Amino acid sequence: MELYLDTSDVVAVKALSRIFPLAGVTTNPSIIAAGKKPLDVVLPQLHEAMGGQGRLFAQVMATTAEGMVNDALKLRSIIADIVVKVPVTAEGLAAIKMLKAEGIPTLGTAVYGAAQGLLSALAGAEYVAPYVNRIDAQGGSGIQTVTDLHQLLKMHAPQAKVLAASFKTPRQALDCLLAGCESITLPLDVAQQMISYPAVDAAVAKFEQDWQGAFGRTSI
Amino acid sequence: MELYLDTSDVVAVKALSRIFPLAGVTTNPSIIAAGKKPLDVVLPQLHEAMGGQGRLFAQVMATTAEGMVNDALKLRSIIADIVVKVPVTAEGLAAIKMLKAEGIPTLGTAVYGAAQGLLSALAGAEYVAPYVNRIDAQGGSGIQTVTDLHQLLKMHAPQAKVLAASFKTPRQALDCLLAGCESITLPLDVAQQMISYPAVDAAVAKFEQDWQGAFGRTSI
Amino acid sequence: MELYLDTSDVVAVKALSRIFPLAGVTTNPSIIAAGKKPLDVVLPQLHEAMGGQGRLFAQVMATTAEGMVNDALKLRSIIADIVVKVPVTAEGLAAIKMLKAEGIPTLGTAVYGAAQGLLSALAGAEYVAPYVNRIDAQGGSGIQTVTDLHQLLKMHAPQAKVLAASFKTPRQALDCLLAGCESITLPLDVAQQMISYPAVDAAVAKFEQDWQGAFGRTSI
Amino acid sequence: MELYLDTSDVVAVKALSRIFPLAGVTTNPSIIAAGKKPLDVVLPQLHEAMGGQGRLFAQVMATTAEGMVNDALKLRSIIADIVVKVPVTAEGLAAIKMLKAEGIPTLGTAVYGAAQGLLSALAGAEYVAPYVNRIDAQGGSGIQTVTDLHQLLKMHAPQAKVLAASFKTPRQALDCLLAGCESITLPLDVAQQMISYPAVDAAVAKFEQDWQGAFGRTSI
Amino acid sequence: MELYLDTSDVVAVKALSRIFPLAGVTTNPSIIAAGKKPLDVVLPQLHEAMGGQGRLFAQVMATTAEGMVNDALKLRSIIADIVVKVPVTAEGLAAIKMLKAEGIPTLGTAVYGAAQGLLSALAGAEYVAPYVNRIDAQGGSGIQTVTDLHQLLKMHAPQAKVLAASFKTPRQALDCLLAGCESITLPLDVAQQMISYPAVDAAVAKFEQDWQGAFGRTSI
Amino acid sequence: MELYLDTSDVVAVKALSRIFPLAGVTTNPSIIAAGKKPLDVVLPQLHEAMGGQGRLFAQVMATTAEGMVNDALKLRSIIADIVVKVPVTAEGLAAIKMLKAEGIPTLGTAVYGAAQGLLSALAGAEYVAPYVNRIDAQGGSGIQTVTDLHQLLKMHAPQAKVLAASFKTPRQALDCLLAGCESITLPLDVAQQMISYPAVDAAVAKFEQDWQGAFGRTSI
Amino acid sequence: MELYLDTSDVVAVKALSRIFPLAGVTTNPSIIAAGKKPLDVVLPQLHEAMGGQGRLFAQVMATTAEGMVNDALKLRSIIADIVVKVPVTAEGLAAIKMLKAEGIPTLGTAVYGAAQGLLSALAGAEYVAPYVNRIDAQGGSGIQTVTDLHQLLKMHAPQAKVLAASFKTPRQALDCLLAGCESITLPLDVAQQMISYPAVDAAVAKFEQDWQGAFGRTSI
Amino acid sequence: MELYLDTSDVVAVKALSRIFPLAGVTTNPSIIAAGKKPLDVVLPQLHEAMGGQGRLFAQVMATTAEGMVNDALKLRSIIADIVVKVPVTAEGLAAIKMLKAEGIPTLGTAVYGAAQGLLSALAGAEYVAPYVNRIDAQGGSGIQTVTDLHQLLKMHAPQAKVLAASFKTPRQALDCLLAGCESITLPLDVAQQMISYPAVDAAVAKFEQDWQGAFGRTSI
Amino acid sequence: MELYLDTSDVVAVKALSRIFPLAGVTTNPSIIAAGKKPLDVVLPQLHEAMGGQGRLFAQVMATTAEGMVNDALKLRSIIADIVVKVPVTAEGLAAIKMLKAEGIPTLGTAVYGAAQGLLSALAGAEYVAPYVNRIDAQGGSGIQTVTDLHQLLKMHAPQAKVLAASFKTPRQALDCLLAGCESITLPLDVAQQMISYPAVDAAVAKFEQDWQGAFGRTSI
């Protein structure tokens, strides 16, 4: 299981990398834009925020297969081992096949359907990223799509991995993990909620109080 | 998983071969007729439309086993490695056995029942093609037939593959893939719908809008 | 159960009205456009083809609630008891509430989600029409949406009815009916497939054969 | 629950009417042909074999709606209260509507699909008869069709009844009854098997044996 | 079904009240605080934003039962028919019983468990509000809690209603409605997402395109 | 739903009666013994602790039906409307029938099996009390026993009620309530846990904090 | 998967051996009797009729274990590699154990229960043959018995195989195959129905029609 | 699967050993007591009735671990390879651990719960024997207990085997076998019922009858 | 399976170690604080009560990752091979990662959610301990959390083990074991209940009664 943070917040990544067992960081056009810093600036900073290790993901902007391949080359020139995110559209599929031939790892993104996702994997994508919350928000079932997609990859593209993305609540992430997703990327708020619980704090505080009351110390 | 297009539209095949990761093209008597071009003309053209690679399927027309075998020989003379489609009838089963003995790969077609499909595989067919939509249209359940057929081949004819065919909607294709079908052939309209989504286009548009608002351009 | 035909083909409606127990005819902008005849011409003809009885449905074209209400008035001036179809959008919802106040029956159309559909019923719509095949085509489950919608109306808007629409295969129609839909509208091809079966024709043939064999004739 | 015998065997009907609680007898073109006796002869004999009570069913032979209506009139002239069986085809549906208007009870027969069956009920048929075993024999599921049909009538045509027919084994009849069918017609062999059991005979024999051993006789 | 907006944004309520079929508005300490206007200012404005109709909900702040009852009286003095929200704590339960005796309608809020919720209903609360998203965020299942709570009220406190609250995505709201909740309150962002869909907008656009392609205009 | 406390702790009952919506208090030989106060002392005190209202339950000690009836008379002399608990044994069943004839309400207690419980209801018991935790502790499933018992009473003794007892955790109580139990009696620790939650306390504190920040006070 | 024909009709076996992929032929006392030819005549003819290759099954007639073993020897003297069918009775089990010691392959037949079937396998039988239709005819569930038996062999006698027999309809055969039966023997009528379908014949006809309409010829 | 007879009836064991594929015989204190013969007499006779082969089981009578180990030694002195049954009590568990160290095989008996059974296996027992019928008789579910125990051993004590015991009907034995029990011991009446069926006898008689009708004899 | 006792009661551990097949003992701050005895005294004593064998678990008290690592070192200095329990908080996760690098085995404790638990395993924890009863007490489902957690570890952290803790009843322990937990720690009362059953004691008594009635003694 590869755990990623979906952000362009360098400071947050450095801080959280010490807490979570991160595999890297994922980004998309909106996340980058929100950060205001250009790709040539943020990507290296993010890589550094992770001690120069881990995996990074960045998305192409072009609309034609040829343009997307050129975008991929540009991204790889910034981060040599970066994984290129390609929207799974007709041209996106064509680009994925071309990138597969060039040996550049890709992730099929903007996936709103299981069959669409499978096609990107069959075309060569190493990762397939369904937008869980967006599917949920638009009247579907993000979890069912993830479940169906995972089943499709398991029997039709065994080496491809589901990278679940787009979350508003920890429950969605939990369900994707229970569905078997090999990887997942979490926005900062959901990630924080996943490690902070009133019940846990109440238990721990109780342990700390009983111990201090019995041994007058805050350590073993 | 082997993805095929169910068509005799050479121009469309060339165009779509660049987008989809195609394993080849399947044809049947009605599709060929609709194209208006004879077999010795269209098959080579289709083969060329795929870059001289991929697998092709063509159907026999004879009603007797002997006649079907002769049809198979004629088809193989047009395309040396073509897979011969044989309707799964009493004479068809006899033809399939004969063709196995001759080493000519076959596909049991016109399958409307799971047991019927299994028999063609036991007779030697490498592929079994249930007519999903026709079963649905006639008051049955194309998906249940495919599910039952796949289970039968899995435990009784492991090397045989289900090649799901006859589709009116992407949902039928999705369900066949979720059922575990090793191969599938899609008509052009369903294939196009499978890669075109209003939600996906909206997401890409949003990404472009955010990118421009932060960088004054829509290019990477 | 209310059975409708989704068409603007007057001749076909007249012919099929003698076969199917029709409740009326439904139309939408595309169906009207494909017919080429204007509303003030086609609607009256459809009513006539229906023997002067039955229910008709026509859709508004305006984008604002005020405009939609005006469209509704125009439609009602053509067919006094026509049911006005309103796309379930923000403005559509506003229009539905206004039309409810005016006593003009409405149908919430262009429904791609169950909650969206329920909202139109809560706003006053007598019918809610999910686009089954479109939901299926776009990676969702038209049947699950219909099932969820029917459940929502059953417990939250008991007097509202689901009018299932958008079909490519009889199976989709069957599943909607099994889900409990109170009404359904079928395109001509699906309707025809629903009453034509090779197995049925064969049974009729065998009966005649046995009859002729015992009585030397195929008639009573 | 209306229990019928599917036969034209007058002697058998007379004998079995004393054993089973029969509602009447059903016939079809093949069953009549097998008996060799013409309609004007067997129908009255069957009515008599039923003690002059019960209900009878006979099938039309014509292919056009007009012809079927004429056949219905002829059948009613033989047996005044007979229920007319009409194959559920396009013309059959038209005939059913006409017969409803004329007040002649009908049964939609030769039903191989649930939707097809529902249509006959919506057209006016009092009974809908799916051919259970034929559906089973042709690769489908007669029981699922019956289950689906019963569900459709229950929610969309409450006063219509399913009259399950076509049986090769008691299990099929049991499953139709468990599905809720309001009526059923059994061929003579299945009916006999339904009341003859080795286990039952063994129990009865054991009771006689114990009684004999205690009271020196097998009589009460 | 009672549809509420969870907000203190008067302008938004006025605007959305013409779109959604609202039953009223719900508020809580954090929502009021975020709006900055005092209770005796915002409550009357919200009532106004809804044409002087609809139901309002406001929460007590006191920690003792006696104090909560006094808070309830104060709230009722601002809005005569307001429903008083009481956190379901030991003292909250006591307050609910006292308010039931005084005839002041209450809602048991801050519900994180089904049994806790049931207790508030047994104490007299007309509504029980589980915090769906918070339960989800804290490692539980908001939907299961809602499902369990609804069942408990259905069989043990039939007149009490579940008022589902705390949402981050439309899917949570849909699931609560499918669970049978009699009422629900939505934050503004989720409510807006529930009526805005790329697929719906695309369908409307297509309708307009076909209409103009046939009639030369997009109106009428 | 009747909510009871399973205790002989008068002070606790007085305190909790203002918090929980209690129907009364249940006792058994061990609970009374634990309290040390004799029956004719504690029962009146418990009745007073509840403000002179509510229902009380006390158990017989005799081993013969005649002795149990005498015990019942003695209990009724202490509390006129008390419900007499009778262990469901052979003699207990006999006593229950006798007490029904005498018009003294009974509860069949010490129930470890569903059939055993049903028998007590058929004999006349108004309540049947399965020992949920003891069944769980001894390798069975207290919840399944309660579920089975409730189903048995529902269809075979409609007026009898299940009074679920013996709890170590709130989850057991929740499951009994979800199973449909008409009544339940909780030991003090489980009852307290059912109304105290770290998550709830965390939420309430947050509301106070936000309120303070906006209005400079913690009061409404 | 071993497919057998349950018959003594030599001519039919010869004809069908060319169509179906047969593993051999099974016979029983009634089947042999129906053919009127003695064992020493039919068995040899069947061996050559099936293709000189394949497996044959014949049943013992003796009632004692010793007699059954002698019958087995006689059968083996007619067909050296024949599999001996032994009714699973007390003496039958004893015979199966003896034949196991002698190295003569056996099949436990006349199986009406799963446990009974398992016992024959534990005793040494290579095949276990439940009488599916007879179980169905006598008020049980042939399919459930087969399902249970297959499970028992799978976990308790892995090398034993279920040889499903006794069929009246293709559906029973399909269900046995779906249950995982390693072998099955079909009566001639069911076998023929399994390869003859009105829908399949119709598909072949339409293909021919479209073909000749476009190419002015019937041939490929 | 090890099949045992639960009895001390030497003559019966000798007779049935020729019919069933027995693994041996199990005994318990009550079974032995009923036989009236002491252990030093019956055990050797049972071993002899088994042809001097197979496995035997006998139970300790001591109540302390030390006493049980001494009892084990006494039993082993009678039958060198006997498996010692130890009731799964606290002292029994201690005894099982000691017997494991002493290399004497044990069976944890008197198991009324799954966790209890698991503990005996973890302590060293080779077999675990739940009392199926007693569990059923006492208001529980013997089959569920067996199912749970088998699951526990399968995942937590792989080398331990369930030896299901205590039966009143064949169905219980069948269900234990379907649950996966590796061994089972049957009382003589249940064993006999498992191999004697009216339906089977009828089938055999019919075969003999048909044979006679065709060959004038009932022998081969 | 690893069976542990959750206690600091040295005398009890010594006594129970002779009965249960223990893997060791687990402790937490509350267990230790209650004992008032320091860890450098209690741990060695528990280790000794275990015969100088088995695994021990002790919890850190520090609130920062650095402090927790120091606590771990101190614990390891008391018991060289002790497993260090770390509360799964943000700092706890950081500590687990650090301890993983130092080669000190850890257990992620105070787990109230499945995702939280998985994170501790992904960080390096060998064991993950959900507080089953506390989750149950706080309105959740301890068993569902354990089930979800086990599934997450099985597919995402295969070498990590669930160590179920916090029990009030044997049923909770049984369900955790049925869920597949690799380890479990029981408080003394639940452990004792798991090996003491009235039904078992009664069975032993009956055996003794029968034995004496037949042999004049209850021994041998």
Side-chain angles (χ1 to χ4, degrees), chain G residues 184-205:
Chain G
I184 188 168
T185 185
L186 310 171
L188 304 186
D189 56 357
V190 173
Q192 286 301 294
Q193 290 162 34
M194 197 166 313
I195 62 174
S196 178
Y197 307 81
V200 174
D201 295 340
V204 178

mmCIF file of all heavy atoms in Angstrom, chain G residues 184-205:
data_model
loop_
_atom_site.group_PDB
_atom_site.id
_atom_site.type_symbol
_atom_site.label_atom_id
_atom_site.label_comp_id
_atom_site.label_asym_id
_atom_site.label_seq_id
_atom_site.Cartn_x
_atom_site.Cartn_y
_atom_site.Cartn_z
ATOM 1 N N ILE G 184 -21.205 -35.910 -15.965
ATOM 2 C CA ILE G 184 -22.649 -35.884 -16.083
ATOM 3 C C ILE G 184 -23.071 -36.804 -17.220
ATOM 4 O O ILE G 184 -22.352 -36.944 -18.203
ATOM 5 C CB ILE G 184 -23.120 -34.440 -16.371
ATOM 6 C CG1 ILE G 184 -24.640 -34.351 -16.308
ATOM 7 C CG2 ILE G 184 -22.607 -33.987 -17.735
ATOM 8 C CD1 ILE G 184 -25.149 -32.916 -16.301
ATOM 9 N N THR G 185 -24.218 -37.457 -17.067
ATOM 10 C CA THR G 185 -24.712 -38.333 -18.119
ATOM 11 C C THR G 185 -26.115 -37.886 -18.479
ATOM 12 O O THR G 185 -26.987 -37.759 -17.613
ATOM 13 C CB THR G 185 -24.698 -39.819 -17.701
ATOM 14 O OG1 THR G 185 -25.078 -40.613 -18.828
ATOM 15 C CG2 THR G 185 -25.655 -40.088 -16.537
ATOM 16 N N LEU G 186 -26.323 -37.639 -19.765
ATOM 17 C CA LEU G 186 -27.596 -37.141 -20.255
ATOM 18 C C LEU G 186 -28.424 -38.108 -21.080
ATOM 19 O O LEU G 186 -27.889 -38.869 -21.888
ATOM 20 C CB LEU G 186 -27.353 -35.900 -21.118
ATOM 21 C CG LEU G 186 -26.475 -34.776 -20.570
ATOM 22 C CD1 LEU G 186 -26.204 -33.775 -21.685
ATOM 23 C CD2 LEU G 186 -27.163 -34.102 -19.384
ATOM 24 N N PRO G 187 -29.751 -38.100 -20.875
ATOM 25 C CA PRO G 187 -30.620 -38.983 -21.653
ATOM 26 C C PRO G 187 -30.634 -38.297 -23.019
ATOM 27 O O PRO G 187 -30.332 -37.103 -23.110
ATOM 28 C CB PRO G 187 -31.957 -38.879 -20.927
ATOM 29 C CG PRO G 187 -31.933 -37.483 -20.374
ATOM 30 C CD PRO G 187 -30.519 -37.368 -19.854
ATOM 31 N N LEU G 188 -30.980 -39.027 -24.073
ATOM 32 C CA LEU G 188 -30.967 -38.455 -25.414
ATOM 33 C C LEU G 188 -31.827 -37.217 -25.648
ATOM 34 O O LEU G 188 -31.393 -36.292 -26.332
ATOM 35 C CB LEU G 188 -31.337 -39.529 -26.443
ATOM 36 C CG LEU G 188 -30.461 -40.787 -26.421
ATOM 37 C CD1 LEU G 188 -30.856 -41.697 -27.580
ATOM 38 C CD2 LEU G 188 -28.990 -40.404 -26.527
ATOM 39 N N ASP G 189 -33.036 -37.179 -25.093
ATOM 40 C CA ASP G 189 -33.880 -36.015 -25.328
ATOM 41 C C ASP G 189 -33.313 -34.727 -24.747
ATOM 42 O O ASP G 189 -33.329 -33.693 -25.412
ATOM 43 C CB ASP G 189 -35.322 -36.253 -24.838
ATOM 44 C CG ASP G 189 -35.413 -36.643 -23.367
ATOM 45 O OD1 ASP G 189 -34.381 -36.801 -22.679
ATOM 46 O OD2 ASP G 189 -36.560 -36.797 -22.895
ATOM 47 N N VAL G 190 -32.796 -34.790 -23.525
ATOM 48 C CA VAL G 190 -32.215 -33.606 -22.895
ATOM 49 C C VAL G 190 -30.959 -33.164 -23.643
ATOM 50 O O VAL G 190 -30.728 -31.970 -23.828
ATOM 51 C CB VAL G 190 -31.873 -33.879 -21.410
ATOM 52 C CG1 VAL G 190 -31.110 -32.688 -20.809
ATOM 53 C CG2 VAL G 190 -33.163 -34.111 -20.625
ATOM 54 N N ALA G 191 -30.148 -34.128 -24.072
ATOM 55 C CA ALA G 191 -28.928 -33.816 -24.807
ATOM 56 C C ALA G 191 -29.265 -33.061 -26.091
ATOM 57 O O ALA G 191 -28.619 -32.071 -26.425
ATOM 58 C CB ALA G 191 -28.166 -35.099 -25.132
ATOM 59 N N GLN G 192 -30.286 -33.525 -26.805
ATOM 60 C CA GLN G 192 -30.695 -32.881 -28.048
ATOM 61 C C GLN G 192 -31.221 -31.471 -27.822
ATOM 62 O O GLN G 192 -30.947 -30.569 -28.609
ATOM 63 C CB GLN G 192 -31.756 -33.724 -28.759
ATOM 64 C CG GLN G 192 -31.188 -34.975 -29.404
ATOM 65 C CD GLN G 192 -30.113 -34.651 -30.430
ATOM 66 O OE1 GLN G 192 -30.390 -34.053 -31.473
ATOM 67 N NE2 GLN G 192 -28.876 -35.034 -30.132
ATOM 68 N N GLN G 193 -31.979 -31.282 -26.747
ATOM 69 C CA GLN G 193 -32.521 -29.968 -26.430
ATOM 70 C C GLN G 193 -31.389 -28.995 -26.100
ATOM 71 O O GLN G 193 -31.481 -27.798 -26.376
ATOM 72 C CB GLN G 193 -33.481 -30.072 -25.236
ATOM 73 C CG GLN G 193 -34.792 -30.785 -25.549
ATOM 74 C CD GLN G 193 -35.513 -31.257 -24.299
ATOM 75 O OE1 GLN G 193 -35.458 -30.612 -23.255
ATOM 76 N NE2 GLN G 193 -36.203 -32.392 -24.404
ATOM 77 N N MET G 194 -30.317 -29.521 -25.520
ATOM 78 C CA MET G 194 -29.172 -28.703 -25.134
ATOM 79 C C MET G 194 -28.400 -28.118 -26.320
ATOM 80 O O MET G 194 -27.594 -27.202 -26.145
ATOM 81 C CB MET G 194 -28.229 -29.530 -24.257
ATOM 82 C CG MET G 194 -27.217 -28.715 -23.462
ATOM 83 S SD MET G 194 -26.433 -29.728 -22.181
ATOM 84 C CE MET G 194 -27.932 -30.534 -21.474
ATOM 85 N N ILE G 195 -28.636 -28.636 -27.523
ATOM 86 C CA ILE G 195 -27.935 -28.124 -28.700
ATOM 87 C C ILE G 195 -28.871 -27.592 -29.781
ATOM 88 O O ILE G 195 -28.431 -27.264 -30.887
ATOM 89 C CB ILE G 195 -27.022 -29.199 -29.331
ATOM 90 C CG1 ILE G 195 -27.860 -30.384 -29.809
ATOM 91 C CG2 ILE G 195 -25.987 -29.655 -28.314
ATOM 92 C CD1 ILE G 195 -27.068 -31.421 -30.576
ATOM 93 N N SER G 196 -30.159 -27.495 -29.464
ATOM 94 C CA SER G 196 -31.141 -26.992 -30.422
ATOM 95 C C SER G 196 -31.926 -25.826 -29.829
ATOM 96 O O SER G 196 -32.657 -25.999 -28.854
ATOM 97 C CB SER G 196 -32.105 -28.108 -30.828
ATOM 98 O OG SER G 196 -33.092 -27.623 -31.728
ATOM 99 N N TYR G 197 -31.776 -24.646 -30.426
ATOM 100 C CA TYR G 197 -32.457 -23.447 -29.934
ATOM 101 C C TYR G 197 -33.076 -22.592 -31.034
ATOM 102 O O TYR G 197 -32.410 -22.236 -32.006
ATOM 103 C CB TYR G 197 -31.483 -22.554 -29.153
ATOM 104 C CG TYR G 197 -30.730 -23.244 -28.043
ATOM 105 C CD1 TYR G 197 -29.592 -24.007 -28.310
ATOM 106 C CD2 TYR G 197 -31.166 -23.150 -26.724
ATOM 107 C CE1 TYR G 197 -28.912 -24.659 -27.290
ATOM 108 C CE2 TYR G 197 -30.494 -23.800 -25.698
ATOM 109 C CZ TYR G 197 -29.372 -24.551 -25.982
ATOM 110 O OH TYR G 197 -28.719 -25.204 -24.962
ATOM 111 N N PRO G 198 -34.362 -22.234 -30.887
ATOM 112 C CA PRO G 198 -35.035 -21.403 -31.887
ATOM 113 C C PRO G 198 -34.289 -20.083 -32.102
ATOM 114 O O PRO G 198 -34.191 -19.596 -33.231
ATOM 115 C CB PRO G 198 -36.414 -21.179 -31.273
ATOM 116 C CG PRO G 198 -36.659 -22.467 -30.549
ATOM 117 C CD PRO G 198 -35.324 -22.745 -29.890
ATOM 118 N N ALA G 199 -33.770 -19.506 -31.017
ATOM 119 C CA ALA G 199 -33.042 -18.245 -31.094
ATOM 120 C C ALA G 199 -31.755 -18.395 -31.897
ATOM 121 O O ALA G 199 -31.377 -17.497 -32.650
ATOM 122 C CB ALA G 199 -32.721 -17.729 -29.684
ATOM 123 N N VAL G 200 -31.075 -19.523 -31.726
ATOM 124 C CA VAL G 200 -29.838 -19.760 -32.455
ATOM 125 C C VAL G 200 -30.148 -19.938 -33.939
ATOM 126 O O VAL G 200 -29.490 -19.351 -34.794
ATOM 127 C CB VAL G 200 -29.111 -21.017 -31.927
ATOM 128 C CG1 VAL G 200 -27.894 -21.322 -32.791
ATOM 129 C CG2 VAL G 200 -28.688 -20.796 -30.481
ATOM 130 N N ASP G 201 -31.162 -20.738 -34.243
ATOM 131 C CA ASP G 201 -31.529 -20.970 -35.636
ATOM 132 C C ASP G 201 -31.931 -19.663 -36.316
ATOM 133 O O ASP G 201 -31.630 -19.443 -37.491
ATOM 134 C CB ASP G 201 -32.674 -21.988 -35.730
ATOM 135 C CG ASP G 201 -32.267 -23.370 -35.245
ATOM 136 O OD1 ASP G 201 -31.052 -23.650 -35.199
ATOM 137 O OD2 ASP G 201 -33.160 -24.182 -34.922
ATOM 138 N N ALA G 202 -32.606 -18.791 -35.571
ATOM 139 C CA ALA G 202 -33.034 -17.507 -36.105
ATOM 140 C C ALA G 202 -31.833 -16.616 -36.411
ATOM 141 O O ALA G 202 -31.830 -15.896 -37.411
ATOM 142 C CB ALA G 202 -33.966 -16.807 -35.116
ATOM 143 N N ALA G 203 -30.823 -16.661 -35.546
ATOM 144 C CA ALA G 203 -29.618 -15.860 -35.746
ATOM 145 C C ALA G 203 -28.903 -16.298 -37.026
ATOM 146 O O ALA G 203 -28.445 -15.469 -37.812
ATOM 147 C CB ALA G 203 -28.687 -16.005 -34.542
ATOM 148 N N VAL G 204 -28.827 -17.600 -37.251
ATOM 149 C CA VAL G 204 -28.172 -18.100 -38.450
ATOM 150 C C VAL G 204 -28.932 -17.673 -39.709
ATOM 151 O O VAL G 204 -28.328 -17.307 -40.716
ATOM 152 C CB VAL G 204 -28.071 -19.632 -38.414
ATOM 153 C CG1 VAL G 204 -27.425 -20.145 -39.690
ATOM 154 C CG2 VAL G 204 -27.264 -20.060 -37.200
ATOM 155 N N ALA G 205 -30.258 -17.705 -39.642
ATOM 156 C CA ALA G 205 -31.082 -17.331 -40.786
ATOM 157 C C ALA G 205 -30.909 -15.859 -41.166
ATOM 158 O O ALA G 205 -30.730 -15.537 -42.342
ATOM 159 C CB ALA G 205 -32.550 -17.633 -40.493
#
